[PDB]
Design a binder for this molecule. Structure first.
Ligand SMILES: *[C@@H]1O[C@H](CO)[C@@H](O[C@@H]2O[C@H](CO)[C@@H](O)[C@H](O)[C@H]2NC(C)=O)[C@H](O)[C@H]1NC(C)=O
Ligand code: NA
Ligand code: NA
Length: 350
């Protein structure tokens, strides 16, 4: 079989979310679809955080199939963390069901992790990085032979650069579970193979980067000659090692690091009237990033300067990834996440 999740684009390409349903009878939630993590969680109805007061929450007491657990749930993202306890219940998405899906019932988070209309997050990466130890929903489906083809196809719609766009766009893209949507891409899919040691994040090697026509050195202390890049639908921008970010912005005349005084340490800005030409090389092909994705607008009162989508994020030397490649990149390609043989594919959008 196949099944489609319609995506809502929240926050001007900040987060892409789809509907999950949990419990009996079903309780429905809009959750971040996150190819950079592997746990499902939803804000619980007992949560006393302010955001929980203003969004839909999961009432464990009104699900007749809910199996409680005292086991703690704790997950950390680059943007913050979420805590609560594990639970088990029937979960559906895209017309599929997992009867005894383990997930987090969250009752605290770091400030501003999520808000209305979101209620949680569904991890689309591999079991080995699931904090809960549970097999991810998507992975159960793939492993069971339920899918026509063992892959997920992703389209993220772009609103950044549209001056009349809303903070909630329900026409936000699509995830196809169990195949690729041939109406949304053109030409052949270029698959980059992922070996058995790399089934954690969805990650692939960066071969090269070109900005303003200059090939940037992508060597790093953590990642050696070539970084391993999380292809991460759950992040907004492109996070890279500090050294690499410095090198990137050195290729744009007039670029400078934003001071920590601004409140934007790790970000860089450059002249707003410079259209930046930039591509990332994966699997022997260059993939362009449109100027509408690259230019985030002015972050300070100096309106002649605009912030770029690449930012400095030094990561744990315990991380297997040195780049986090978010929606800023992904909006420019149709993306296939292939379970078997394990691979990430890219195609030109139609
Ligand atoms: C592939 O993507 C296309 C384009 O988004 C989907 O087409 C829509 O499907 C719905 C109902 O299934 C129609 O009512 C819409 O009018 C279609 N939109 C357009 C622009 O044609 C299509 O459903 C997707 N296919 C799969 C299998 O997910
Ligand atoms: Na993530
Ligand atoms: Na420099």
């Amino acid at each position: 079989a196949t099944g489609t999740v319609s995506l809502t684009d929240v926050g001007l390409d900040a987060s892409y979310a789809g509907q999950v349903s949990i419990g009996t009878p079903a309780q429905d939630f809009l959750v971040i679809m996150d190819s950079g993590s592997s746990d499902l969680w939803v804000a619980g109805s007992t949560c006393t955080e302010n955001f929980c007061k203003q969004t839909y929450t999961f009432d464990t007491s009104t699900s007749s199939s809910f199996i409680t657990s005292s086991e703690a749930f704790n997950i950390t993202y680059g943007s913050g963390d979420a805590d609560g306890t594990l639970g088990t219940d029937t979960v559906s998405m895209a017309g599929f069901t997992v009867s005894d899906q383990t997930f987090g019932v969250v009752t605290s988070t770091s400030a501003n992790l999520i808000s209305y209309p979101l209620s949680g997050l569904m991890g689309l990466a591999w079991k080995s990085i699931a904090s809960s130890g549970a097999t991810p929903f998507w992975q159960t489906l793939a492993a069971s032979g339920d899918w026509d083809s063992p892959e997920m196809g992703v389209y993220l719609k772009r609103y950044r650069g549209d001056n009349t766009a809303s903070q909630i766009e329900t026409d936000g893209g699509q995830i196809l579970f169990g195949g690729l949507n041939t109406s949304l891409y053109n030409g052949s899919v270029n698959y980059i193979s992922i070996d058995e040691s790399e089934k954690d994040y969805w990650r692939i090697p960066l071969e090269a980067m070109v900005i303003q026509g200059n090939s940037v050195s992508i060597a790093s202390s953590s990642g050696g000659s070539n970084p391993s890049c999380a292809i991460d639908t759950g992040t907004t921008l492109i996070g890279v090692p500090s050294q690499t970010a410095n090198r990137i912005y050195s290729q744009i005349a007039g670029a400078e690091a934003l001071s920590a005084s601004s409140g934007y340490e790790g970000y860089y800005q450059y002249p707003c009237d410079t259209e930046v030409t930039v591509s990332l090389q994966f699997g022997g092909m260059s993939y362009s990033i449109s100027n509408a994705d690259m230019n985030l607008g002015s972050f300070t009162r100096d309106t002649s300067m605009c912030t770029g989508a690449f930012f400095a994020m030094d990561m744990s030397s315990r991380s297997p990834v040195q780049w986090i490649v978010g929606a800023s990149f992904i909006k420019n390609v149709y993306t296939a996440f292939r379970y078997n043989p394990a691979a990430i594919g890219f195609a030109e959008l139609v």
